[PDB]
Design an enzyme around this catalytic site. Structure first.
Site: not given
Ligand SMILES: Nc1ccn([C@H]2C[C@H](O)[C@@H](COP(=O)(O)OP(=O)(O)OP(=O)(O)O)O2)c(=O)n1
Ligand SMILES: Nc1ccn([C@H]2C[C@H](O)[C@@H](COP(=O)(O)OP(=O)(O)OP(=O)(O)O)O2)c(=O)n1
Ligand SMILES: Nc1ccn([C@H]2C[C@H](O)[C@@H](COP(=O)(O)OP(=O)(O)OP(=O)(O)O)O2)c(=O)n1
Ligand SMILES: Nc1ccn([C@H]2C[C@H](O)[C@@H](COP(=O)(O)OP(=O)(O)OP(=O)(O)O)O2)c(=O)n1
Lengths: 197, 199, 198, 198
Positions: A93, A17-18
């Site tokens: 990632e 998840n995010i």
């Molecule tokens: N197919 C996707 C991939 C990501 N996002 C959005 C959700 C978040 O607002 C942002 C980043 O989400 P990720 O979970 O991919 O990246 P993070 O930096 O949150 O991951 P972590 O904190 O686990 O490293 O992109 C989206 O709308 N659609």
């Protein structure tokens, strides 16, 4: 015969998840950069598309911007999936899979993508299956409760994410669960589940 | 190596402004369907995607619907470009080239595609160049004047095209000229220019 | 084949935040000037371009001057990167990479470089990559904490830097880390990380 | 060795004032595309830099935008000058030389480029001179009178050029003359003068 077919090493995808800590996890592999192809924090791409912040636009106005945002995500994933490398391991990632099975599906369900947009994305997904090799041998699933994910989101305080509610993370959690635990999608490789709580 | 590389016969692309008579021109090859791969009238796909009329939505609300429309058009062209065939000739109405160099560019200039929509499309185009083989051996350009194209459009009277002004056709015309006459695009293959203004 | 390609010895780049002690560290090799090509501290060039102090103009009015400033930095970096030498070793304060990955990027994020200005710098960087050979064998990263770099800046008291806040060093710090520790940036060579908090 | 050195065919540059008819002249070589490398109408690039219209920003606010505008023009010229080709002839609309000798100079003289901006661009030109090979064997000068140039500009009616005075075309005309007629610039290859008042 697809693009990138036969050009790729054993491939690990980091999913969750995010705010599940995907980037923090991948940071541990930094010392091994000579033997691993590491493609991390794709979100920096989506905030700066020759200056334009698609992520910001998406959350402000999803009915207009969610389709080009997810289209641009799909692309960056493709670019990473098919990137050349002489290294014997690749770790990424996220993937094109979480985009399709989690975020695009959820944006259809909540109405941010109207049918016509969803349809256009799915037809693209299908053509991509036929045309481009997507190597995937292991998915590491960083499993969390929606509540822990929400805490890490609130703590990080990315401006774009300021209005993201817990319910949206709950919805996204179930979809990751549907795909990664409950085998409800047609993909289709090994999964290691890690407790990221 | 790219997808569809080495799988494609001599390929001819029929290009021209809206209402230039591309389907009519391609119609005259029907009797040779067994010797030629003919991929014609892509507008029919755009008007019904599992029931959804993207062309109509684009025209009604370009700022919301122009990006997904062009993205679907790009796909349908790629589907046609890469279509497998056991024949020695393929002939297609339009190409990925005119979506890119003519329609997407004009929708950028006119404000229908915001800059982050345009950049997303352009970035897709660059990656498609790297990953997908697009066979293009000859282009037939049905060159018209914007006035003749416009008259044929008003005659045909598609509901989607009911509000299209002549200015849009003039813009589209200069763009087809810039590409097919003036060789201003990186795309290079042989062009055959026909006068499509007559009967 | 690029300009300067195959003309350059083993090359070390000294990198680190503003005030991190890059020139000081490089001063230790002075005694070996005859066996080492030493190119330091480029800021002296940016403060006096036929009598024009671009560093000062940039801090005073960044929306107008950040763009020709980074353009000049880029140029002085290239002059150094490609400077000819018969020595077995080259050492340089800074590089084209920190201008691009840290300073230009932060000026974009803070609004000093409007989009068209940033696009223009980026397109140049893309062309420079194609045309000019930049020898880079080792980066020595003088890792500091933002507060330690800030104190040094205050101690030094360059007038051009009198309005620079701690926040700006914090932003630059995260960008050096993103590049030199986390390797989020396309360029790779070996990095030696040093604690420069003393 | 400079970048692109030894990789270039005999190269023709098409030069003249704004609205002198360079693109129109170059259109005449369209049929010979397969034997001639034809690089025309670079103004379309300066108007759409990933969606940013630099040409428009420059005319609207020259003291802020002229430096990155000319910096980008210079780049595009370099991209053209060094573009690979198997063809035995290359013909380009404009060149790096006219950006430097005419437009950059005039924007210095009128104040649109302050000293430090001009200094940055010139220092770049000197570096480009050392590092990048610019093939130039013939310049075709489409000579006009400032009044004809001015009429064509008004007739074309490019929105970006709507506030362009006659004085400006007079100034530019004399600079092209200085360079292509009166041998006032360091550069020399053969010049073919054509009456484009026709
Ligand atoms: N197919 C996707 C991939 C990501 N996002 C959005 C959700 C978040 O607002 C942002 C980043 O989400 P990720 O979970 O991919 O990246 P993070 O930096 O949150 O991951 P972590 O904190 O686990 O490293 O992109 C989206 O709308 N659609
Ligand atoms: N990349 C594209 C391709 C087409 N169209 C639009 C313009 C018309 O509204 C409709 C169909 O135009 P075409 O010229 O492709 O097809 P026609 O059937 O109009 O061609 P002809 O009349 O020449 O057969 O789709 C578009 O907006 N973007
Ligand atoms: N691409 C760059 C490089 C430097 N600077 C600025 C930051 C400082 O105001 C000045 C010099 O900073 P440096 O870190 O390059 O040099 P110092 O002399 O401060 O380094 P040290 O104190 O570590 O020797 O130039 C900038 O705006 N853009
Ligand atoms: N180094 C340069 C080159 C051109 N221009 C500007 C002047 C015009 O506003 C626009 C285009 O001018 P050109 O003369 O290069 O191109 P035209 O298309 O006007 O040439 P022609 O009409 O002769 O074909 O760019 C500029 O400011 N600086």
């Amino acid at each position: 015969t697809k693009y990138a077919e036969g050009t790729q090493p054993f491939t690990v995808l980091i999913e969750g998840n995010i705010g599940s800590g995907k980037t923090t996890y991948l940071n541990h592999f930094e010392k091994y950069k000579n033997d691993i192809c590491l493609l991390t924090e794709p979100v920096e791409k989506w905030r700066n598309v020759n200056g334009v912040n698609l992520l910001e636009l998406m959350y402000k106005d999803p009915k207009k911007w969610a389709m080009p945002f997810q289209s641009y995500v799909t692309l960056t994933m493709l670019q990473s999936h098919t990137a050349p490398t002489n290294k014997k391991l690749k770790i990424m990632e996220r993937s094109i899979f979480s985009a399709r099975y989690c975020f695009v599906e959820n944006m259809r369900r909540n109405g941010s993508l109207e049918q016509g947009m969803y349809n256009t994305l799915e037809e693209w997904y299908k053509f991509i299956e036929e045309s481009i090799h997507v190597q995937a041998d292991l998915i590491i699933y960083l499993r969390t409760s929606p509540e822990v994910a929400y805490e890490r989101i609130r703590q990080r305080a990315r401006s774009e994410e300021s209005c993201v509610p817990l319910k949206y993370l709950q919805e996204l959690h179930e979809l990751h669960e549907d795909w990664l635990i409950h085998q409800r999608r047609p993909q289709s490789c090994k999964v290691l589940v890690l407790d990221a709580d």
